[PDB]
Ligand binder design. Structure first.
Ligand code: 8DG
Ligand code: MN
Ligand code: MN
Ligand code: MN
Length: 129
């Protein structure tokens, strides 16, 4: 099947809230909550991809971020490797730059069932921080 490398950014403010967007109804993992991110392209690194994806999707440039978790997940029709970057400093103010819903969500209130199932261990690990 299809095999993808995906970089996403966990955007955390100083109030323990995360900037979360919601995927379109016609997308893979439709209507799910998500960390902004996307496919790592040929000729770019995982670090470059999370910067580019956050610039495109929510209008911020991550800086001094760290790899929170890397994991693989087998969906029904595709295999992806997810790079979860913890982003605690950035230039700009995140918004729905691609017209998608986005809002700040308390970390304690996140419900893993609202996200793709691949995110389950990451959401749990974030809550222990
Ligand atoms: N963005 C994001 N994707 C996730 C998460 N968890 C998860 O399993 N995924 C999966 C859903 C998709 O199969 C894939 C992300 O690809 P995408 O749909 O964001 O692709 P993209 O933004 O590059 O799309 P495009 O603008 O290039 O057309 O990873 C997450 O927290 N954030
Ligand atoms: Mn993309
Ligand atoms: Mn995306
Ligand atoms: Mn994108």
């Amino acid at each position: 099947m299809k095999k993808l490398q995906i970089a996403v950014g966990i955007i955390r403010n100083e109030n323990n809230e995360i900037f979360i967007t919601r995927r379109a109804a016609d997308a893979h993992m439709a209507n799910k909550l998500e960390f902004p991110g996307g496919k790592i392209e040929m000729g770019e690194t995982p670090e470059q991809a999370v910067v580019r994806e956050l610039q495109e999707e929510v209008g911020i440039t991550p800086q001094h971020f760290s790899l929170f978790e890397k994991l693989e997940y087998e969906f029904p029709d595709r295999h992806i490797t997810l790079w979860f970057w913890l982003v605690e400093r950035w230039e700009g103010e995140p918004w729905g730059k691609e017209g998608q819903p986005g809002e700040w969500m308390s970390l304690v209130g996140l419900n893993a069932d609202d996200f793709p199932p691949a995110n389950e261990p990451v959401i749990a690990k974030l809550k222990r921080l």
